[PDB]
Structures are given as C-alpha cells and as structure tokens.
Design an enzyme around this catalytic site. Structure first.
Site, PDB file in Angstrom:
ATOM      1  N   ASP A 258       7.872   4.293  12.313  1.00 39.73           N
ATOM      2  CA  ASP A 258       7.328   5.270  11.383  1.00 39.73           C
ATOM      3  C   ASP A 258       7.075   6.683  12.388  1.00 39.73           C
ATOM      4  OD1 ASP A 258       5.608   6.525   9.730  1.00 39.73           O
ATOM      5  OD2 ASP A 258       4.139   4.914   9.539  1.00 39.73           O
TER       6      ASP A 258
ATOM      7  N   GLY B 267       0.832  -1.246  -0.023  1.00 44.33           N
ATOM      8  CA  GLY B 267       0.126  -0.022   0.014  1.00 44.33           C
ATOM      9  C   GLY B 267       0.724   0.986  -0.078  1.00 44.33           C
TER      10      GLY B 267
ATOM     11  N   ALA C 100       0.145   9.271   0.713  1.00 43.75           N
ATOM     12  CA  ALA C 100       0.880  10.851   0.565  1.00 43.75           C
ATOM     13  C   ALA C 100       2.184  10.926   1.071  1.00 43.75           C
ATOM     14  CB  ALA C 100       0.089  11.935   1.396  1.00 43.75           C
ATOM     15  N   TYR C 101       2.993   9.778   1.544  1.00 47.56           N
ATOM     16  CA  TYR C 101       4.247   9.668   2.008  1.00 47.56           C
ATOM     17  C   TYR C 101       5.200   9.072   1.042  1.00 47.56           C
ATOM     18  CZ  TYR C 101       1.988   5.083   2.896  1.00 47.56           C
ATOM     19  OH  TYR C 101       1.226   3.948   2.977  1.00 47.56           O
ATOM     20  N   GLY C 102       5.053   7.742   0.649  1.00 52.10           N
ATOM     21  CA  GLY C 102       5.778   6.980  -0.458  1.00 52.10           C
ATOM     22  C   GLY C 102       5.252   5.571  -0.576  1.00 52.10           C
ATOM     23  N   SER C 103       5.384   5.213  -1.682  1.00 57.20           N
ATOM     24  CA  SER C 103       4.882   3.629  -1.907  1.00 57.20           C
ATOM     25  C   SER C 103       5.954   2.876  -1.205  1.00 57.20           C
ATOM     26  CB  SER C 103       5.069   3.441  -3.327  1.00 57.20           C
ATOM     27  OG  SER C 103       4.148   4.276  -4.029  1.00 57.20           O
TER      28      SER C 103
END
Lengths: 16, 335
Positions: free
Chosen positions: B165, B28, B31-34
């Site tokens: 995270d 998944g 808006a952060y990174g794949s």
C-alpha cells in the site's frame, strides 16, 4: 524461507 | 485470450471481475477505492481486489493511476507487495474506465497483530530487519514510500512481512512543516516510530492536533540546533520554532527500559531530527542489532526504474492511453 536461508531456528508462532 | 467475467453487486455497486476470483466479500472502502477480499482459484490463495472507479477523472488522478501501476508492476521483492493481477472489463480504450488491482493477502495487518500479542525481541528483530530489507529495495528504485504505518505492514503466522500500500502519527517532522526537500530518510523515521511501538506496545507519538503531534516529538528528540535552522529554507518554518519553549534532546536508554541496548542504539540513529544525519536502510541492515540475520549478499536492490514519465505534461486521455497499455502488457507472476 528467509529464516531458513539465514540458518536461524524458527520463532514462536504468531496467531492468526 | 480474454477471460470470462461475471457481475455481482458489492459495497454497493456492480463489480465485474474474471471468474477466477470467487467468494468476494467487502473489506471496506474510502477515499482511495473500494476493496473486496476474494479467493483466487488460480493460485488457491485469498487476495485483495481494489476497484478504481475514478482513475482518469482529471490529470492529477490520471497521472497518479499511471504512477502507481508502473510502480507496482516494477516491485518484485520478498518483503514488498507485488502486483498479482490487473484487469478491466472494458474491451477497448474507448470504453475504458474502471481498473482493478489484485494483491496477495498475508495473514494479518500488524496494527491488528500488536493488539493480539506482546512481541518478543526475537519478533521485533526479524520484523524490523525485513522492513529495512524491503525498504532498501524500494529506495534503490529512487522511490519514497511516504506512508509507512502498521496498517501497511502485512505479516503472517510465521512472522514473515511485506511492505504494501504505497503512498498520521508516524510521519517525519520535515514533511508536516514543509521545511525542505524531503529525502528517503523520511521512511527511516517511520521505521523508528514503528520499532518503538513494537517494543513497548504503546504508540510513541500519539498526536491529536498537528501542533500536539509536533510537541510530543520535540520533548523526546529536542528542539532544532543552530545547524538545522540554517537548513530550513522558508522563514515561516524557521520562526515557528522560536517562542515555542525549547526542550532538550533526551536519552533513549532511559525512555525504553528493559529494551535491548543495541535496539536502543538503532532507535537513536533513526529518530534524529535532522534528516541529513538520519541513518539509511543499507546502513541500518549492517547494524549490530541485526547481527544474526544480516547477509550483504541476500539483500538485493531493484532493477533500474524509468520514471521519465514524471516530467511529461499530458492530457487525460494520454495518461489514460498509457495506463491501458500497461494493463494490456501486464505479465502475471509465475508459481
């Protein structure tokens, strides 16, 4: 082994 | 020595990674990174691989990238995520764009766990102890996590935990309202919300609107007193309390019934509304509720962490250069 280092018997296992 | 990369297509773009990483599957994006899950052939573990494709798009983005990378390289603690590898296909600062970060995946996320099980007090106890033990280490580096969520707590089948995270229901009031200078006790608020949910199995403050969220909180901990209002700086904030109906602070022993009384005590200490009076990690570890596991000598702090970069105003390519340096200078862990 943080539980080991505290001399604590092992808890009920968590799946998964 | 430069490793050999290969190219495949995922999520759906082209990922180019070193061959040590196999069996990539997308877990998944946003808006952060794949992010893809992969099997690390060097360590034989399953890992998380994060692709930053807009790291230097602007000064804000570029400094953020350097900030996170410095921090992850610095985090080495049993209860905190550590940076297992960082790499780029780019062969020179000239062609530098994409940054990938890899991290160890522990068994499951705790949001997912708390569905699949009702947790015993013996679980919550050991779980909350490690958050604090890792949080103590995070705060000792003069860092604030700012985003403690169950989704951000990895746990495995032995109930071992790690904080991961780094940085809307678990977030301290003083942030949502832009009251004040927000200090490290903002993470203790989240720990208090998390501890409640673990015990009862239900979310403690499921706010829908910003106001709703706030409402739900005050009905429990009560409305600010004469002492705290003097300490809210701006008048927008100070007057946003007034014609809103006041609620008294409640007794938590009556809110959480069947709960361990020492647990109830420790929640009283975490969910106080005034940040000045809210307990710390070092003080939390010494609480009776953790009597069994607390060991002052095995609760380490962090090597001094140089944040002086936070004062610098630089151009993108300057931040871009600095991050490339940190990628080149990365030392992989051992074992």
């Amino acid at each position: 082994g943080l539980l080991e280092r505290r001399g604590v018997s092992e808890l009920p296992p968590l799946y998964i | 020595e430069r490793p050999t990369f290969y190219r495949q297509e995922l999520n759906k773009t082209i990922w180019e990674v070193p061959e040590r990483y196999q069996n990539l599957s997308p877990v998944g994006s946003g808006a952060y990174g794949s992010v893809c899950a992969a099997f690390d052939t060097k360590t034989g573990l399953r890992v998380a691989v994060k692709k930053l494709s807009r790291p230097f798009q602007s000064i804000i983005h570029a400094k953020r990238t350097y900030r996170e990378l410095r921090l992850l390289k610095h985090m080495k603690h049993e209860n905190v995520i550590g940076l297992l590898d960082v790499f780029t296909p780019a062969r020179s600062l000239e062609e530098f764009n994409d940054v990938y970060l890899v991290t160890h995946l522990m068994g499951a996320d705790l949001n997912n766990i708390v569905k699949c099980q009702k947790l015993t007090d013996d679980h919550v106890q050991f779980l909350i102890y490690q958050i604090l033990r890792g949080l103590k280490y995070i705060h000792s580096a003069d860092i604030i996590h700012r985003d403690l969520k169950p989704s951000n707590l990895a746990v495995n089948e032995d109930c071992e935990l790690k904080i991961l995270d780094f940085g809307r229901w678990y977030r301290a009031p003083e942030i949502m309202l832009n009251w004040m200078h927000y200090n490290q006790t903002v993470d203790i608020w989240s720990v208090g919300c998390i501890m409640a949910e673990l015990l009862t199995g239900r979310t403690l403050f499921p706010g829908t609107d910003h106001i709703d969220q706030l409402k739900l909180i005050l009905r429990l901990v009560g409305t600010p007193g004469a002492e705290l209002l003097k300490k809210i700086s701006s008048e927008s904030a100070r007057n946003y309390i007034q014609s809103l109906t006041q609620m008294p602070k409640m007794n938590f022993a009556n809110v959480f019934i069947g709960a361990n009384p020492l647990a109830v005590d420790l929640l009283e200490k975490m969910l106080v509304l005034d940040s000045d009076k809210r307990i710390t990690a070092a003080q939390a570890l010494a609480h009776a509720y953790f009597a069994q596991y607390h060991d002052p000598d095995d609760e380490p702090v962090a090597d001094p962490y140089d944040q002086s970069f936070e004062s610098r105003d630089l151009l993108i390519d300057e931040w871009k250069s600095l991050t490339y340096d940190e990628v080149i200078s990365f030392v992989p862990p051992p074992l």
